[PDB]
Structures are given as structure tokens and as C-alpha cells.
Amino acid sequence: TNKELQAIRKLLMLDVSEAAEHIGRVSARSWQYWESGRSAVPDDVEQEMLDLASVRIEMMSAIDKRLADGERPKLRFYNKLDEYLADNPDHNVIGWRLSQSVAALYYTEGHADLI
Amino acid sequence: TNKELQAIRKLLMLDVSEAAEHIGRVSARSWQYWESGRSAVPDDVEQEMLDLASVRIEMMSAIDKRLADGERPKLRFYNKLDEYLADNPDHNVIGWRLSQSVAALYYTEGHADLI
């Protein structure tokens, strides 16, 4: 539904324009129409957003591994996209947002430091 | 630091303009300055952001209570601010975003449905 689509997008920290370009391959206006509720949300886009959410879960699982190993992780929080891309040259703006989503969660809940 | 400030802000699903107006009581430019890293984040702003994160934890704890009572919660995802305000007339735009952040988490991670 429109509500599930927006929920996942925001949890993954994607701006509408970023989700539209990279996941929907549609204009931002088209993506807004999907989230507005005045349109059918196509099921394929919803499925691709759930696939991307599984990437966030994989990234969380890796941090959980460090925690089980006794480490208090120091996670890079990239305020600047360009710095993320410099350190992660095989990723893009969507990877940057997923990194923010994961680092912010672990920090805010008291489980990791940000660097 | 600027990284912690932006991380909490984004996790709570607040736009810069919303955080600036209601939490900082400053302009978006000033809030962006605090998120830039150029100087230290003010003590009172830091504390208020931590306190709002605690409100989010309290909201999660209330849902955890319902799960422990055997409910499968149907959480209302408010894509429309005014609908949230009508249902929660003592709250404002910041409370709306907190509601989105909690509903999106429990939905995307499989514990609740959205309506």
C-alpha cells in the first residue's frame, strides 16, 4: 500500500527523489503519487523496496556479530555523501542512506558510537 | 557532535525545518550549521534530542506491551500530518514524525501491520 511504501522508504532514510530515481526509475512526482494514496502502488516497486530493506538487515546482522564478539562498535556516520562515496567506491547514494539508517539506529539506542 | 545530532534527527524522521522550528527554535540555516561539524552542538539541543529519543523508546515499549498481551498490532501510519493531529490533538508535527518512526520500524521488521 502507499503507507507501507512510505514507511519503508523513510526507515531506509531515502529522500523521495533518491527512491524515485534508483528504485522506481520514475520521476519524483510519480513516486509522490504512489505515496499519496490516490493511486495504485505497483507491487513490483513494493517488492524491490522490501529487497532493499533486507540489505539493511544484513548490515545490522554484521554489527550484531561484532557486539556478540564483545566489541562496542564505532560506526561511521557520514553526514557528507561525498565522504561516504570516497570510502565506499562500489556504492552509491542509496548505499549511503542505508549506512546512515544502520549507524543512526545503533547509536541512538545506545549500542554503538559514531565516528 | 554534529553526527549524533543528525543521526537522532533522521532516525526520528524529522525534517531539518521541523527540528529547527520546534526543537532548536532557530532557523533551518542555524540547524544546518549545528549539523555541519564547524562547532559544537549546544548542550540544551543535545539533551532535548536525547529526550525525544526516549519518547520513541517509550512508544516502542507500549507496543511491546501489546505484543506481550497477544495482540498483532495494526498501527496507523499517518502519511497525512493533519490526520495524526486530529487523532492526537495535544501533539504537534514532532510527535507525528515519532509516530511514523515507530510504525515504520515495527512494520518493516515484521511485528506489526500498517493501516
Residue numbers in the entry:
A (entry chain A), B (entry chain B): 2 to 116
The authors write:
Bacteria are under constant threat of invasion by bacteriophages (phages) and other mobile genetic elements (MGEs). Among the many protection strategies employed against these invaders, the highly diverse CRISPR-Cas systems stand out as the only known adaptive immune systems in bacteria.
Here, we report the first structure of an Aca protein, the Aca2 DNA-binding transcriptional autorepressor from Pectobacterium carotovorum bacteriophage ZF40, determined to 1.34 Å. Aca2 presents a conserved N-terminal helix-turn-helix DNA-binding domain and a previously uncharacterized C-terminal dimerization domain. The elution volume during the final size exclusion chromatography run indicated that the 13.7 kDa Aca2 protein forms a dimer in solution, corroborating what was observed with our previous constructs. The Aca2 dimer structure shows each protomer stacked against one another in opposition, like the letter X, such that the HTH motifs are aligned along the “base” of the dimer. Examining a single protomer shows that the proposed NTD HTH and relative C-terminal domain (CTD) are in fact small clusters of secondary structure elements abutting and joined by a longer backbone α-helix, α4, such that the protomer forms a single globular protein. Whilst the NTD provides the HTH motif for DNA-binding, the CTD stabilizes the positioning of the NTD from the other protomer by stacking α6 against the other protomer α1, thereby aiding dimerization. Whilst the upper CTD surface of the dimer contains mixed patches of both electropositive and electronegative potential, the NTD HTH motif is clearly electropositive and primed for DNA binding (left).
